[PDB]
Amino acid sequence: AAGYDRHITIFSPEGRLYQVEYAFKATNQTNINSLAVRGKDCTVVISQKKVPDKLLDPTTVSYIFCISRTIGMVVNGPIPDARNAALRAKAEAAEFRYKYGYDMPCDVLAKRMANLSQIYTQRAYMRPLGVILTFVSVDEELGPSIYKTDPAGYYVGYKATATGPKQQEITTNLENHFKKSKIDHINEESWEKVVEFAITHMIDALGTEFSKNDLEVGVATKDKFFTLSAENIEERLVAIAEQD
Amino acid sequence: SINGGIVVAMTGKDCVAIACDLRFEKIFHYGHVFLGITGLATDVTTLNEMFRYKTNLYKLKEERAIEPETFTQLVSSSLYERRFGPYFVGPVVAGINSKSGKPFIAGFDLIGCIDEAKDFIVSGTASDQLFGMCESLYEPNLEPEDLFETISQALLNAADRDALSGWGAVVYIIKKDEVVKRYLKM
Amino acid sequence: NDRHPLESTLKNWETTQRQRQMEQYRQIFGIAEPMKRTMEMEIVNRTDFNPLSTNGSIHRDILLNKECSIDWEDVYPGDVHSKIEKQLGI
Amino acid sequence: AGLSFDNYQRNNFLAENSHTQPKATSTGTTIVGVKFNNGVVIAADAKLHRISPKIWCAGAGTAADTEAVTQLIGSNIELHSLYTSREPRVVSALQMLKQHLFKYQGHIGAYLIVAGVDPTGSHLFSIHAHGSTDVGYYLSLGSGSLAAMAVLESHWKQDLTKEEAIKLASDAIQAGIWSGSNVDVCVMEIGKDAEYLRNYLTTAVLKESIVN
Amino acid sequence: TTIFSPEGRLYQVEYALESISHAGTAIGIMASDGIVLAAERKVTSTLLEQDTSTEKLYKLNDKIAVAVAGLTADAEILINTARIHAQNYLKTYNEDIPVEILVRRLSDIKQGYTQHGGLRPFGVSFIYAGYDDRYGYQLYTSNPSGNYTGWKAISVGANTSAAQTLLQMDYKDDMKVDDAIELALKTLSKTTDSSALTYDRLEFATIRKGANDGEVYQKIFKPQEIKDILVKTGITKKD
Amino acid sequence: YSFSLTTFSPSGKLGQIDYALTAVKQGVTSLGIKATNGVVIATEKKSSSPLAMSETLSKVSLLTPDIGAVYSGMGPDYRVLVDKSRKVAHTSYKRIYGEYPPTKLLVSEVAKIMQEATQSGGVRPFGVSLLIAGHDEFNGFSLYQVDPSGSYFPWKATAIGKGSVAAKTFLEKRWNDELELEDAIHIALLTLKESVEGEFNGDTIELAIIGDENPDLLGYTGIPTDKGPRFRKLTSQEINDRLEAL
Amino acid sequence: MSGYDRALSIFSPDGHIFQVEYALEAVKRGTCAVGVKGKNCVVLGCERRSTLKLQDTRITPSKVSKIDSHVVLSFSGLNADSRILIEKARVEAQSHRLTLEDPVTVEYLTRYVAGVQQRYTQSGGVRPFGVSTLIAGFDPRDDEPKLYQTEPSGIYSSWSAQTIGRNSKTVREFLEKNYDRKEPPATVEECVKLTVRSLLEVVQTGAKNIEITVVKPDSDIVALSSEEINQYVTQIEQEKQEQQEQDKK
């Protein structure tokens, strides 16, 4: 057990903070896979919905959060740690918009949230959250955008980031599409084709078809991030089923 | 002890000058940078203590002496700190860039607005008698001996010609590698 | 009084702006948010004592959202046993 | 910390008891603004200040306070540009300047006309010392502001080019003329560097001792 | 964790004293008309910038200098505190700080970091040097414990014992600063782990009076001046 | 109250800092070289995925218009030090002296921040070594390394991270006291070509210089007094053009 | 609380083997410090360890430290700690007069010193001071000599003679034979002679190692020099030769 090295955020002889490595195993406690992609004028987030008990209300299960008018995120990890980080991200965007007189960029919120994770990653009495945060917006400076943030406080931009315990298959299929298409976004002029494209990739990667209630969707255009209802998802599933 | 008094500052070809009233000089130095302060004598001495401290620490921390323009920014930012209750003073910095050789003179209000006249500077109450004399006697690009002559006659002429037994003036003439302090009496 | 109008306001500005912020977060997000934020600040303030350094702390500027902002209070700032017997109680 | 009141009461007895407190230098002279075609001109008759390369100001009231706030906010704008990796917006500087002028309740006597170009376009605003704000295609402050505003209104039209904006700027300044007294101008144009244009218009007894 | 060993002895102070016992050697010698400081610097790096202005030797004010054995990161915190205290004394009294008041000032801060369990002690030993009118030329030493002592000649850091024996047999109470130059260079060449002494391995300084009655002058030697006292002394690594 | 971290081990060693130098020793290599008329600092960008856009992960950072920095170690520790280092330059020195601090005064202040993290309860020391490089009117060009200890050193050239001992041996073998800035750039590009984990091109490599003043980058004309940024971050096309001269 | 008293074998409570016991061990390892009262003086004396050949004597601190014009303190145990303990007492006394129009009383200089030492015992992972002290002097407007000892635990006591540090058993044994509480040394010279005899039995070599301060009423504080204590040592050694040769056999 090596004493304090494994139980507080302090360096092992090797130089490993066991508090951070273990918090990356917490993010896979949901058994949920999520996928995000950039279109031409939008960015889209598709997330696996698990509702095993008949007794749940599926309208209260959601890993997608509206962070402000223009920005939104999916969370991979426990819902208590996803609601805590969503509430911070909502407050950080609100105070930036007041201080600097313009809407908080996705890049700036991912950096601000990643700087907070570096505290818990150095202070021995602070533990890193058990969540990965996947911010998306249509920034006026960088158009459609995706930024991912993790328990170690490392954040970077992305064009098709994804988090889940089967994320490697989705990512390996995304890399092969971006390798053949050679554009860094999917070239659809309307978000309906982007979401349908994002439900064609998660079907093909996870080896299962999806009902309208077994799927989630997000639609980030300029001036609005919003969540789809099950009938808007079924319009896309119907159009996938009309094509094939 | 006498409150007020005048300081005058002036540029020549590779040289500077700082005249002042005696009868405790208004004019201090911190290496090659000279500071003539007029006004309340307590603030003149408190600023001497404060700039001696800051500039000794600068020399220690930075391995070189504080240059005339850097000292201008330091005196103005230090004076500005005292914004709601300022130093009752008119500081006049002077000095010759040790890496350039250019003459520098600047002066400030009590909260640190920088004048940077390329010819001459005045400070103290009843400045505008000397401002006329100094504008009358000055010419550009003097040698050090003529530069001493113009600043010393400015001090003498604008002097109270009724009390010239109570007179005494210090003129620092400052050059690249040499400083001469002439005391001057009648 | 003879004392400058602005003096008592600027003396307490840092405290007042955070105390006012915590009451907005209580109102908009509920008691859990200022309870979280005050305990983070307690861990950072209480586990960070060094008698020769008074120049704030790096994580407190991250927590307070002061990591890229200068006040006049940051450019114009203002015994080890006396510090020790204040930190521990006399 | 910050601006102190140490000798506030000490100087409340000096002025009462007959020391003339030194005069704070004031720039009371005309300052103007021009939201001209694809940019924005500002001018004053030492007096034009930078918050960043693309955002500039003209100041009136206390000279030290117009420099001091524009340099403090210029520091925060530079740090925020480094923090966000984006060019600093005029609305961000306006928010900082106006929010800083409010903390100080108009005891910092800077009256300021703020202009610049940023990734959104070209903007023009003015802040009074109590921290309250104007916007317009053309603004003027200082004693000549009545006469300057009469000239600004009498000749402004949409698609004013650089040269015509610079003429109107200079005529609204020269309509303030009959410290200061010739034009400095800066021109911010949306694709281009801020163009700054300076002045657009035996006797006595001697003893001596050597010193270091 | 600042608790006593059952003998009434402080483990952390002993471990800080083990740390400085590796930390490079420094000698100071008090002549009848000036003080000499010298320090030996383990330059195992070719790309480290020799002709950097300081590492072992530092000014505290216009008449006080130090040599450092120990962690340079720890030393620089104390050195700044001493510089602030020297100028705060000069500001208060209009007079230059007496050497005893400043040496013991840094000995009171270093004792505090040994009593409170949240603080590790400072891994530094200082050989202070200076002049004042109250005493004259003074040479002091201070160590991680907060102990300080007055000396006529002393070594700190590595090889202290060999150096103290070499000082003791050649030191004279009536010697001049140039005899102390010679002695400190001889002592270091008779104590060094490196094969021979040379100007980049050596940090040097002096506290002389000069020709002019009001002067005391602290030449912290640049490398070329050290090469001259090396070739004059007979250490003379010369073409 | 039995409270501190980084206490002394019986052999006279600080222990926790030693473990903090093992985290530094695991990072993607960075390096720096000083020349007669300029300086170079360089590193590789390691992608967590090829879907990541490493135009967002800058590793080479502007501290003041004449000072640059780069790291090896934990990048999160380096984003937080760089923003304190920027705040320090403005608040301690620019706002008192109307000019930016030298590269010895800013390195001392960064090192003072890392020393305070060793001598504390509650906090681990930093997992980064920083190379800070710059120019000043009286010191001239300079390069320094800062470690988790708060120890700082002036260097002619250095390297830190995985490939650092082979890099430091190449830097000793190639450095001479008459290098110019185009020469030092070539030596730095050669050194990263050996240390590279991934692909070598202008997109994977970070490279910055402090060189001559660039009056183009000041973004406003009319003030010759203001010379314009010495610090310039090489564009990905320049890096690919120099990588064609390799 | 120690040794062979053990019920059903034994086990430890919170109790005796503790930080303060190890501070008492540090005090015993520090040089010998002694004090004796007289009819109208008090003399404090100390052991210097014999100074090294390269040590500087003119600036070496006097071991007996003046806290105020009428109060003197000496110590055994840790020097660094005693320096921090004398600073607190000195400012405490100067502050006493500034706020009470009264110089500090010797008993208030002993309750304060032991009092601050007790707070570093009580709690906090701040260690107690490895120091024990003699505090001696006179109150103002009085001619009674006072002499107190303080210990690392913050216990203090009044003595007409006492010794602390190295070898102090043998010194306290000599004092119990040579100090009569009915008829104490009636003159300063005899008081100093008694302290030089007391120290001569325990010091390393001789007159080098002894140093004494004499306190008298009305702030007459007086360190004795090496040359003055050399004439005491020599007179005592003369009387040893005289006593030996006055053998009758």
Going by C-alpha positions, the residue among F166, F83, F86, F77 that lies closest to residue F114 is F77
Picking from B32, B33, B70 by the largest number of F CB atoms within 10 A of its own CB, the best residue to mutate is: B70
**Rounded Cα–Cα distance for residues B121 and B135 (Å):** 10
Picking from D21, D25, D72 by the largest number of B CB atoms within 10 A of its own CB, the best residue to mutate is: D25
**CA distances (Å), origin B70, targets A59, D49, F88:** 66, 19, 19
Q: How far apart are the first and last CA of chain G?
A: 52
**Rounded Cα–Cα distance for residues A20 and G168 (Å):** 59
Query: The tokens of G213 are what?
Result: 């301060």
Q: How far apart are the first and last CA of chain D?
A: 36
Residues of B in contact with E59 (CB under 8 A): 60
Q: Do the Cβ atoms of A125 and C47 come within 8 Å?
A: yes
Identify whether D15 is part of a domain.
no
SS3 state of residue G179: coil
SS3 state of residue A101: coil
Side chain identity at residue B142, one-letter code: L
Residues A167, A31 contacting (CB under 8 angstroms) = no
For chain C, what is the radius of gyration of the CA atoms?
16
F67 contact partners, CB below 8 Å, separation of at least 6:
F89, F100, F103, F106, F132, F133, F134, F135, F210, F231
Q: Please classify residue E225 by burial: count the beta carbons closer than 10 Å to its beta carbon, then call 0-12 exposed, 13-18 middle and 19+ buried.
A: middle
**Rounded Cα–Cα distance for residues B174 and F149 (Å):** 47
Picking from F2, F8, F136 by the largest number of E CB atoms within 10 A of its own CB, the best residue to mutate is: F8
Q: Do the Cβ atoms of E139 and G56 come within 8 Å?
A: yes
Q: Does domain G3-242 have CATH number 3.60.20.10?
A: yes
Residues of B in contact with F137 (CB under 8 A): 99
A239 contact partners, CB below 8 Å, separation of at least 6:
A192, A196
Going by C-alpha positions, the residue among E129, E30, E119 that lies closest to residue E77 is E119
F2 contact partners, CB below 8 Å, separation of at least 6:
E1, E117, G125
G231 contact partners, CB below 8 Å, separation of at least 6:
none
**CA distances (Å), origin G209, targets A1, G81, G203:** 56, 22, 6
Please report the DSSP string for chain C in residue order. Answer: ----TTHHHHHTHHHHHHHHHHHHHHHHH-THHHHHHHHHHHHHHHT---TT--S--HHHHHHTT-TT---HHHHS---HHHHHHHHS--
Full 3-state SS string of chain E: CCCEECCCEEHHHHHHHHHHCCCCCEEEEEECCEEEEEEECCCCCCCECCCCCCCCEEEEECCEEEEEEECHHHHHHHHHHHHHHHHHHHHHHCCCCCHHHHHHHHHHHHHHHHHECCCCCCCEEEEEEEEECCCEEEEEEECCCCCEEEECEEEECCCHHHHHHHHHHHCCCCCCHHHHHHHHHHHHHCCCCCCCCCCCCEEEEEEECCCCCCCCECCECCHHHHHHHHHHHCCCCCC
For residue F231, what are the β-bridge partners?
Answer: F210
Residues in F whose CB is inside 8 Å of some CB of A read 5, 16, 19-20, 22-23, 26, 48-57, 75-77, 79-80, 83, 117, 122-125, 127
Side chain identity at residue B27, one-letter code: I
Q: Do the Cβ atoms of C6 and D105 come within 8 Å?
A: yes
Residues A138, A221 contacting (CB under 8 angstroms) = yes
Query: The tokens of C44 are what?
Result: 């950072």
Domains present along chain A, CATH in parentheses:
3-243 (3.60.20.10)
Q: Do the Cβ atoms of E84 and B57 come within 8 Å?
A: yes
Torsions phi, psi for E228 (to 5 deg): -70, -45
Neighbours of chain B (3+ CB pairs under 8 A): C, D, E, F
SS3 state of residue A185: coil
SS3 content of chain D, % helix, strand, coil (to 5): 30, 30, 40
Q: What is the CATH number of the domain that holds B32?
A: 3.60.20.10
CA dihedral sign of residues E64, E68, E73, E77:
negative
Side chain identity at residue F13, one-letter code: K
Sheet holding B120-123, edge to edge: B120-123, B7-12, B15-21, B169-175, B178-185, D205-211
Side chain identity at residue E224, one-letter code: Q
Q: Do the Cβ atoms of F96 and B61 come within 8 Å?
A: no
**Rounded Cα–Cα distance for residues E111 and G84 (Å):** 8
Check CB contact of D68 with chain B, cutoff 8 Å. Answer: yes
Residues G41, G72 contacting (CB under 8 angstroms) = no
**CA distances (Å), origin B91, targets A216, B27, B154, E94, G116:** 71, 9, 19, 21, 50
Going by C-alpha positions, the residue among D53, D46, D73, D58 that lies closest to residue D139 is D58
**Rounded Cα–Cα distance for residues E30 and G218 (Å):** 41
Question: Around Cβ A4, how many Cβ atoms within 10 Å?
Answer: 12
**Rounded Cα–Cα distance for residues F39 and F32 (Å):** 8
Check CB contact of G125 with chain F, cutoff 8 Å. Answer: yes
Check CB contact of A95 with chain C, cutoff 8 Å. Answer: yes
F120 contact partners, CB below 8 Å, separation of at least 6:
C47, C48, C49, C50, E118, F4, F5, F6
Tell me how many domains chain D contains: 1
Around A150, how many Cα atoms within 13 Å sit in the side-chain half-sphere? 21
- Using CB atoms, pick whichever of E115, E116, E153 lies closest to residue G54: E153
Residues F27, F16 contacting (CB under 8 angstroms) = no
Angle, CA of G222, G228 and G230, to the nearest 5°: 140
SS3 state of residue D186: strand
Full 3-state SS string of chain F: CCCCCCCCECCCECCHHHHHHHHHCCCCCEEEEEECCEEEEEEECCCCCCCEECCCCCCCEEEECCEEEEEEECHHHHHHHHHHHHHHHHHHHHHHHCCCCCCCHHHHHHHHHHHHHHCCCCECCCCEEEEEEECCCCCCCEEEEECCCCCEEEECEEEECCCHHHHHHHHHHHCCCCCCHHHHHHHHHHHHHHHCCCCCCCCCEEEEEECCCCCCCCCEECCCCCCCCCEEECCHHHHHHHHHHC
Query: Which residue shows structure tokens 């195993």?
Result: A25
Identify whether D163 is part of a domain.
yes
Residues G96, G74 contacting (CB under 8 angstroms) = no
**CA distances (Å), origin F202, targets F45, F161, F234, F244:** 10, 21, 9, 10
For residue A6, what is the DSSP state? G
Distance, C-alpha G102 to centroid of its chain: 25
**Rounded Cα–Cα distance for residues F31 and F191 (Å):** 8
Query: Which residue shows structure tokens 């009819």?
Result: G39
For residue F70, what are the β-bridge partners?
Answer: F131
For chain E, what is the radius of gyration of the CA atoms?
18
Alpha helix segments (H runs only) across G17-137 = 19-29, 79-100, 106-122
Question: Around Cβ C17, how many Cβ atoms within 10 Å?
Answer: 12
Question: Around Cβ A122, how many Cβ atoms within 10 Å?
Answer: 24
A:161-220 residues touching chain C, CB 8 A cutoff: none
**Rounded Cα–Cα distance for residues A63 and D98 (Å):** 40
**Rounded Cα–Cα distance for residues D116 and F130 (Å):** 36
Angle, CA of D186, D190 and D193, to the nearest 5°: 50
Side chain identity at residue E86, one-letter code: A
Residues D190, D39 contacting (CB under 8 angstroms) = yes
Q: Do the Cβ atoms of E149 and G55 come within 8 Å?
A: yes
SS3 state of residue G200: helix
Going by C-alpha positions, the residue among G58, A201, G2, A237 that lies closest to residue A228 is A237
Side chain identity at residue A84, one-letter code: N
**CA distances (Å), origin E48, targets A197, F30, F148, G3, G227:** 57, 17, 18, 61, 55
**Rounded Cα–Cα distance for residues F59 and F78 (Å):** 9
CATH of domain E1-236: 3.60.20.10
Going by C-alpha positions, the residue among G162, G133, G166 that lies closest to residue G150 is G133
Residues of A in contact with F76 (CB under 8 A): 114, 117-118, 121, 152-154
Architecture of domain F1-245: 4-Layer Sandwich (3.60)
Question: Around Cβ E179, how many Cβ atoms within 10 Å?
Answer: 17
Identify whether D174 is part of a domain.
yes
For residue B171, what are the β-bridge partners?
Answer: B19, B182
Q: What is the CATH number of the domain that holds D37?
A: 3.60.20.10
**Rounded Cα–Cα distance for residues E105 and B123 (Å):** 43
Residues E218, E207 contacting (CB under 8 angstroms) = yes
Query: Which residue shows structure tokens 């006080």?
Result: E64
Query: The tokens of E122 are what?
Result: 């400072």
Q: How far apart are the first and last CA of chain C?
A: 35
Going by C-alpha positions, the residue among E117, E145, E7 that lies closest to residue G26 is E7
Going by C-alpha positions, the residue among F156, F163, F133 that lies closest to residue F66 is F133
Full 3-state SS string of G71-103: EEEEEEECHHHHHHHHHHHHHHHHHHHHHHCCC
Residues F211, F230 contacting (CB under 8 angstroms) = yes
Nearest chain E CA: its distance from B58 CA (Å): 11
Residues F59, F43 contacting (CB under 8 angstroms) = yes
Around C4, how many Cα atoms within 13 Å sit in the side-chain half-sphere? 23
Torsions phi, psi for B46 (to 5 deg): -65, -40
Going by C-alpha positions, the residue among B79, B67, B74 that lies closest to residue B109 is B79
Q: Do the Cβ atoms of F90 and D78 come within 8 Å?
A: yes
Going by C-alpha positions, the residue among G86, G103, G82, G85 that lies closest to residue G94 is G103
The method of structure determination was cryo-EM
Residues D123, D140 contacting (CB under 8 angstroms) = no
Torsions phi, psi for A228 (to 5 deg): -80, 145
SS3 state of residue G191: helix
Side chain identity at residue G155, one-letter code: I
Task: Give catalytic residues of D, as residue numbers.
Answer: 29
Q: Do the Cβ atoms of B31 and D212 come within 8 Å?
A: yes
Query: Which residue shows structure tokens 């608790």?
Result: E3
Residues D116, D123 contacting (CB under 8 angstroms) = yes
Residues B8, B148 contacting (CB under 8 angstroms) = no
Residues E144, E123 contacting (CB under 8 angstroms) = yes
Check CB contact of D75 with chain F, cutoff 8 Å. Answer: yes
Going by C-alpha positions, the residue among D64, D70, D49 that lies closest to residue B86 is D64
Residues of C in contact with G123 (CB under 8 A): 88
SS3 state of residue A131: coil
